[PDB]
């Protein structure tokens, strides 16, 4: 039987990978980091409260100008916020109200969203007509589209619930690159700062590092015990952190190809919806199901602070590109800005 | 106050956007959200044409009441990752064929379509997001089941069934077996209706169940539930 021989070879390869990871690990991040000063207590106050959504807010994204926001809720409305003045720049009515992701273009020209309609809809913000119209609708996913991220005005990577990540060409609307290999539904997505690689967290308790220009998985990261719902690169692009339903955040390194540190507490038992990093990467912000965001010392696994003030589950997180503020969205139809 | 002309005009635009958002929310608050569920293509389509590829939107108005019925068919993924989106629906319309008690699902060996429907109903009814959400269970294809129960007994489906091979007793037994999967009888209600291929009063049953759910909701507001 060739199938049993190939299963034995796959088991041998997995054991070789595990042995190479074990032999390459000598001193953990705790053992080197325990000799530096902690960050103390990180206290943040709600500076703005963005009201106007009427259903559970499922996603958000910050602008690269660190002032403009976009948020998605089950109203069927994509509201673009001026976070400095608490002003609604745009309100985009959606064809499908079951939106679970939204992205904002780095140029600021476009907004994507997607959800249970299996379609990433690109919206042209800066039109000659003065309204926000659909640029195009990207179809081809057979499952719910769980995350989308703009590379530029013409390239976008969309995570989806068909156990498949996909890279699209917005000029043609065609499936440029298909990323396959995940067993469970892919729930999160995060682009590298140079947009050369990206990581995806799925429901197979695994994270995979893909290359955009070759379209095939480089490394696979395991260690979680439940469905990964959040993922985010470290700011230099050489590491990333995940968040799953087992109330643990794990930090993984691309070069070491290992898990470095678990950010978990005994008093936290609920799942993690959103994971975001600060500008320096020293603080890891994670949104949980117990209605608040916990700031973690990303180098020391210490609870640096708690961002409490949401009446329902914190579903989405976002730190501005200048690191000035963190914005938490939640199921109680509110967005809050913190400093 | 300490605002420019463009700042004041942007604030005015934001207030107009807030006004349109409030009107849209008030329009959507009077609509009835229904989640349509069932094990495969069993009776969803006949029910849909009786009132009227990701999620399917079905819009119909009955007695000056607009209904939003969502079909999550062909969403072949983990249900728990998107079933919390329908936490605030008015009721769940669960469609079950009565004639597939002896048919096989053909996806798994020795798998019954009826038992797959029981397992899906057990997962949906006792879900954490549907603790207080009522279920309008529809038992599809009663005439086909009635004419085929003479040829094939129900004991091949339920080994512990010892009643007569009649339509009424076995149909009541199937309804009781589906209602026994509700472990939250103190906080939710299951409405069961038997529907034929061409049955006209299906909408009225949905309207009555939705009206009971709406009465249960209004009473909370009055602080009397």
């Amino acid at each position, epitope marked *: 039987s060739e199938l049993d021989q190939l299963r034995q070879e796959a088991e041998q390869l997995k054991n070789q990978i595990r042995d190479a990871r074990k032999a390459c690990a000598d001193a953990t991040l705790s053992q080197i980091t325990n000799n530096i000063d902690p960050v103390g207590r990180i206290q943040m106050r709600t500076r703005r409260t963005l009201r106007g959504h009427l259903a559970k807010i499922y996603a958000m994204h910050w602008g690269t100008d660190s*002032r403009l926001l976009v948020s998605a809720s089950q109203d069927g409305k994509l509201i673009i916020w001026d976070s400095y003045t608490t002003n609604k720049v745009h309100a985009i009515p959606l064809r499908s109200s079951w939106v679970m992701t939204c992205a904002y273009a780095p140029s*600021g020209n476009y907004v994507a969203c997607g959800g249970l309609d299996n379609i990433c809809s690109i919206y042209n913000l800066k039109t000659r007509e003065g309204n926000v119209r659909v640029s195009r609708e990207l179809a081809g996913h057979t499952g719910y589209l769980s995350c989308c991220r703009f590379l530029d005005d013409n390239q976008i990577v969309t995570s989806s619930g068909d156990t498949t990540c996909a890279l699209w060409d917005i000029e043609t609307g065609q499936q440029t690159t298909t990323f396959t290999g995940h067993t469970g539904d892919v729930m999160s997505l995060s682009l590298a700062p140079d947009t050369r690689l990206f990581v995806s967290g799925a429901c197979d308790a695994s994270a995979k590092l893909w290359d955009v220009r070759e379209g095939m998985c480089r490394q696979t990261f395991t260690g979680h015990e439940s469905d990964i719902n959040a993922i985010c690169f470290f700011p230099n692009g050489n590491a990333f952190a995940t968040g799953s339903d087992d109330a643990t955040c794990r930090l993984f390194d691309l070069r070491a190809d290992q898990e470095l540190m678990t950010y978990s507490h005994d008093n936290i038992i609920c799942g993690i919806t959103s994971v975001s990093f600060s500008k320096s990467g020293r603080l890891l912000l994670a949104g949980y199901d117990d209605f608040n965001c916990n700031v973690w010392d990303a180098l020391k696994a210490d609870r640096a602070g708690v961002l409490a003030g949401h009446d329902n589950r914190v579903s989405c997180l976002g730190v501005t590109d200048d690191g000035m503020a963190v914005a938490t969205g939640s199921w109680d139809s509110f967005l809050k800005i913190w400093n | 106050c300490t605002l*420019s*002309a*463009e700042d004041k005009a942007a604030v005015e*635009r934001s207030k107009m956007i807030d006004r349109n958002l409030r009107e849209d929310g008030e329009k959507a608050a009077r609509e009835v959200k229904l989640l349509l569920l069932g094990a495969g293509e069993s009776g969803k389509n006949t029910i849909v044409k009786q009132m009227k590829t990701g999620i399917v939107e079905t819009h119909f108005t009955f007695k000056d009441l607009h209904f939003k019925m969502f079909d999550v068919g062909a969403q072949r993924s983990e249900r728990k990752k998107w079933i919390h989106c329908f936490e605030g629906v008015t009721a769940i319309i669960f469609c079950v064929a009565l004639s597939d008690y002896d048919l096989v699902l053909a996806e798994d060996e020795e798998m019954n379509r009826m038992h797959a429907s029981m397992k899906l109903f057990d997962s949906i009814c006792n879900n954490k997001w549907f603790t207080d959400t009522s279920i309008i269970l529809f038992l599809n294809k009663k005439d086909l089941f009635e004419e085929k129960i003479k040829k094939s007994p129900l004991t091949i489906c339920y080994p512990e069934y010892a009643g007569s091979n009649t339509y009424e007793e076995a149909a009541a037994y199937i309804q009781c077996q589906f209602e026994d999967l509700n472990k939250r009888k103190d906080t939710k209600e299951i409405y069961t209706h038997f529907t034929c291929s061409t049955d006209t009063k299906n909408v009225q049953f949905v309207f009555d169940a939705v009206t009971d759910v709406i009465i249960k909701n209004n009473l909370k507001d009055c602080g009397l539930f």
Partner: single-chain antibody
Amino acid sequence: DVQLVESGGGLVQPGGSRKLSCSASGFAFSSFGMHWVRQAPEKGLEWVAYISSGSGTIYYADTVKGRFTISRDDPKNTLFLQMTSLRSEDTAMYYCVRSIYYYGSSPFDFWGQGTTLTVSSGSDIVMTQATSSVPVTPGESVSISCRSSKSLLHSNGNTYLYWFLQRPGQSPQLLIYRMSNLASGVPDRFSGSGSGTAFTLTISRLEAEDVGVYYCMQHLEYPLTFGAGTKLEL
């Protein structure tokens, strides 16, 4: 395409009443605030009236306030300027101007072709252009300077300075909308700069396509005041 067509102009006896219409097509007329800007035969842009989106805010120039009436009907995309008691100084070519206001918006971006109406026979921000007409060689850089009595820099960091170019026999178009921001469809050879009350507009590699009268307008506070107009010749 975005188009604004004016109508209703003509010869009017003094003290008469005429109504101007501005039919809008090719854009969402309801979401745009709308301005009336007239230009006398002496070649000077003058702001007249403004109506916001939803008709919630209406402003008038001090010379037409209580005597002109601006209104819009969003169902049919028409802007109205009901004028009563017309005197000889109202003889001007009235432009219907399109302007939207949000963060990063470009107001005064589209101007209509204008309708010509003929009448027979203190605290404002003064906008100053030192040069009224200068000759320029094509292919060479030119600078148009503008000054303001009040500082146009606001507390929010925006300097509300607008640059308009009006070619001969054409409606004015927007080039720079907040003292540095290049407009849509205008070449990158137009650049604006300045600080406080001193302003400049640089046109590197000038062509015959740039020949016209250049106006500086402030949008810090109503009424909106234009410059005298710097004309480029040769």
